[PDB]
Amino acid sequence: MLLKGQRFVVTGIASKLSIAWAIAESLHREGAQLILTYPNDKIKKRVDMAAEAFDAVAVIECDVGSDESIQVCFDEIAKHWGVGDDKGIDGIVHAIGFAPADQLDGDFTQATTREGSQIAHDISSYSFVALAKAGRELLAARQGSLLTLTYEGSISVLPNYNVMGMAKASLEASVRYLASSLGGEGIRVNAISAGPIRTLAASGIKSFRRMLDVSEKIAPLQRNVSQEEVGNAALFLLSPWASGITGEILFVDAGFNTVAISEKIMM
Amino acid sequence: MLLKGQRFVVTGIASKLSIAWAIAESLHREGAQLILTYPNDKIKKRVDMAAEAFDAVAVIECDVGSDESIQVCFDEIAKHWGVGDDKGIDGIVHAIGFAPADQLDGDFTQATTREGSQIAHDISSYSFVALAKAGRELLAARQGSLLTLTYEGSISVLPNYNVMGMAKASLEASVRYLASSLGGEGIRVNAISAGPIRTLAASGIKSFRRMLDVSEKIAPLQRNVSQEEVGNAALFLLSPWASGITGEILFVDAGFNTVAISEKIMM
Amino acid sequence: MLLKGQRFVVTGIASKLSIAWAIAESLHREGAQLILTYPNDKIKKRVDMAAEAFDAVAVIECDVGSDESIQVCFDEIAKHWGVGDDKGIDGIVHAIGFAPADQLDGDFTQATTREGSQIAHDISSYSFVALAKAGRELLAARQGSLLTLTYEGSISVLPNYNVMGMAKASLEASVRYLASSLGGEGIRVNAISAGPIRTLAASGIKSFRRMLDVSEKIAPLQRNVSQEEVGNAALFLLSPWASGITGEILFVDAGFNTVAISEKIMM
Amino acid sequence: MLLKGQRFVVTGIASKLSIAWAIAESLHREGAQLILTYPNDKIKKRVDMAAEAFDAVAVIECDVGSDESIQVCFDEIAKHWGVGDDKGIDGIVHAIGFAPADQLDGDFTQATTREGSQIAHDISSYSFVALAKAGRELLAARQGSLLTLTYEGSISVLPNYNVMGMAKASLEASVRYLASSLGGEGIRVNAISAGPIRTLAASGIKSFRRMLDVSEKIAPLQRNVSQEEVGNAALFLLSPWASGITGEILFVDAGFNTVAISEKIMM
């Protein structure tokens, strides 16, 4: 229905719990054709299953740490989607972040290192600019959009978020800059700031479970959001319904970012 | 399809050019049942035509300047929508603003008066709280949402916007407060900040046309948004797709709010 | 020293605990001449003592609820400060807020009334515009500045803050508008957003003491600010040192506004 | 007077036009002892002259691109300022930014490269964290503060600012994180967002002069700020007067950041 005959490149699918899986899901449900990318061979398995679940046009390798990797990915994409009068792409989904585990443990000042910061910014922030660069002509040809996933750590302190907070502030700046750079070609650029999501994996970590729990206690809706809530918001922003929207950070966080002190917290 | 069997109260329809008409339109298109309200008898005509175009369950009077007017409106609504096991309302749309014309002419300090400010805040800002108050039980019964329309004048100066800027900052605060007050009942509260819209009427005013033109010159997409772009974004926020979103200000302004100085402006 | 021969009008002194007392204090310490205003006869006593402590040029009545009251106040001020070649005023301090007590108790939606909102906006927000209006010519003559006191409730929910949150968002909009309206005459307009202050009175209220305590627990400096911290920041903004600053909201809140979830809160 | 017997480490002095020169100046004027740092041997000359003008305790090398360079700098500083019962430092001033010239020319997407972004973030953003790290114990011992210089490009697009916009969003995130990490030791962390400054050098570049000119046209005070305005604001934030302030971005930009469309711009 809504995305009939529209084409999307989705990155960052690591598994069934990935927000990007849910994004892929929402897009497929609405009639879209997908190419999915994978960073390495060990993650390739989970991507293939997504390929299966959603009838993926193609599954292409893409390490956003490698400009060469990105270039060849977009070359491959050109051959499915860059030939004919109907050439182009309707969206690119960036759902990639990484910081060395040791950057995110305890005191920001003690834990943050020159290299970890460099890596965090490269993979989490520059990579979006990199995909914008490689996708420009295809997106331009269908006036399609770019979408990234961010987080409130950028503008508000949360413990152990650390250098990812810096990397996300950076990525949100890139949203604004790209929207200015690309809007002349009718390409929209947007971000969703997802709330903390209770996953299987995440619930594993005492400190993470704790953060999830104060979240629910602060958030107006008195819960954490689900992946599907984020996927449907993403669906919206990638859809013709969002044609008037560029440069937006859309919070899908059950209202967390708007509270200073909740009544529930007062004890 | 998307809003099949869902019920919405839409205010602020003054004519075919009204953003609220386009909102009503988007909601109907997706299968929704509408009650439309009108402030006075002279505006009633335009509302009726909307009633016609969209098969309105009902057309009820509602002056958001009168608590009594609002109460009786919601009494009337109770009789269509507050009986049965399926009782309740899926959304309320607030698309009402007013300031005395003389508040909005030239120097903010010279032009702003105690009474005009009072009127601007009452009709433009308190009225949303007022509808929240009267709608609480119906919204609560279907976990539905509230939606208002705002503008960037709240946080950024634009000439002659004046006391509406203050009134809109207020209204956006009310979005945050209501989201906190109501979220425990599963009621979402959100706002769209629309960009300047080129209408027939508006194009009439030299000073307005001028503001429209610098807008297009600043905005990344190099245009002003259409009512339908705002109606579809509203559709989204009122829909189950937006179930993870409360407290949001969603800009539908073709990216204006994100620019400081455009390259086009540099001359 | 720093404010030798400079003249300030200070409002909002209700007692020794008032932030405005501390502001007056900082200004006097640095060599400034003060006129202090009082709203009513019962508050006049505390103002007089301030007059005593700081060698006030004059003590004039000023109910910011009355345009007539404000006009005559500025007439009186004209006679001390509006004659000679050295005519004018270096600053006006607005430290006035009020909402009916019943507006600020429990559920925002249940508690907020049309009239309380109206009163909150009138006294807390419009009054600053009103003083700007009456002071324009005097400020213009010495290129002096306006300063108001706000609070984070405007942009972030805190319980029972309610309609003052709306009133403060409004007042901060007025800061931006006034800065635009008045800057052509070299008049600066700024605000301080004070953190919660532990006073004698305030510590009286269980709910207030509780809010103070979560504050200290969230704030980076692990304490609440003192009146004197706010008075010295105010001193700065009213001083020639702040000649490049207009339109600013300066947070003096020991860093509260920047935290989402503190480590101390995590239990 | 105000900073009698207080000690500051100032970085980023490149010449007499440097904002950091003006900062040094303001600090000295108020009775402070300075150590100044230099990045390389060719810049060392301008630093020495500052050493002369302000009676610098010491002039130490510090390339914020080298962790080793930073460590040894703080070792040297320890020997002047880390011995005795009065050991410690009252402030550290970070006034360092760099991006490869080619990152800042034309289309953000075309011009931005993986390496330029990496370099911009390393020198402009991580370096502040690096100084925080090395200075922690000295600052802790006198409960002193850190101060950085930023710019509105972080949150609002300006042409050719590009990857520095991203780097500055990052640096402002670091301000928030550091304020949280360090506040327990009574160390404040703040930033000034300076407006565009008309310098000799800068006026040289057609595109820069143009940006300066639209600035003056947009800014409420109808001018650009001077270095001395920034130095005095810095003086304030480094002073005991600012003891209640941490995590702040203080705009010293003559009100630019608050305008959307000026009346002067409307043509």
Ligand SMILES: NC(=O)c1ccc[n+]([C@@H]2O[C@H](COP(=O)([O-])OP(=O)(O)OC[C@H]3O[C@@H](n4cnc5c(N)ncnc54)[C@H](O)[C@@H]3O)[C@@H](O)[C@H]2O)c1
């Ligand atoms: N889960 C949450 O609580 C939450 C909340 C807000 C923001 N986010 C953001 O959502 C995004 C997606 O998170 P997620 O939970 O779906 O999984 P995630 O955190 O694993 O997202 C990162 C993804 O990028 C991939 N990736 C890592 N390095 C790569 C490289 N060099 N090249 C290519 N791909 C690489 C990973 O394999 C993974 O698929 C992230 O950017 C995250 O910051 C998540």
Ligand SMILES: NC(=O)c1ccc[n+]([C@@H]2O[C@H](COP(=O)([O-])OP(=O)(O)OC[C@H]3O[C@@H](n4cnc5c(N)ncnc54)[C@H](O)[C@@H]3O)[C@@H](O)[C@H]2O)c1
């Ligand atoms: N058009 C734009 O450029 C633009 C941009 C941003 C924001 N907005 C906002 O969008 C909203 C809708 O604007 P619009 O262009 O559709 O028309 P509008 O500006 O006429 O919206 C006001 C509506 O409220 C109604 N109304 C006024 N007083 C009332 C009262 N006392 N009781 C009940 N209803 C009353 C009016 O009749 C009208 O239908 C407004 O709040 C406006 O501030 C519009």
Ligand SMILES: NC(=O)c1ccc[n+]([C@@H]2O[C@H](COP(=O)([O-])OP(=O)(O)OC[C@H]3O[C@@H](n4cnc5c(N)ncnc54)[C@H](O)[C@@H]3O)[C@@H](O)[C@H]2O)c1
């Ligand atoms: N104390 C805090 O925790 C805190 C924190 C942030 C913001 N603030 C703001 O600081 C400002 C000063 O607060 P405060 O603690 O010094 O005392 P306050 O809250 O009593 O400030 C209000 C002052 O205005 C006066 N006033 C009230 N109605 C008036 C009228 N009609 N005309 C003239 N004057 C009138 C009052 O008598 C009083 O002096 C307020 O605006 C408050 O919102 C205070």
Ligand SMILES: NC(=O)c1ccc[n+]([C@@H]2O[C@H](COP(=O)([O-])OP(=O)(O)OC[C@H]3O[C@@H](n4cnc5c(N)ncnc54)[C@H](O)[C@@H]3O)[C@@H](O)[C@H]2O)c1
């Ligand atoms: N001038 C403006 O218009 C303006 C406006 C807003 C922000 N700012 C910010 O103010 C700060 C100071 O700018 P400025 O105009 O005084 O001069 P600048 O732009 O030259 O500031 C950079 C300084 O850092 C030094 N530096 C560069 N690489 C270094 C390294 N590897 N190690 C150590 N030092 C290094 C430079 O030599 C110079 O002294 C910058 O961070 C800039 O972004 C300036």
Ligand SMILES: [Ca+2]
């Ligand atoms: Ca937004």
Ligand SMILES: [Ca+2]
């Ligand atoms: Ca600020």
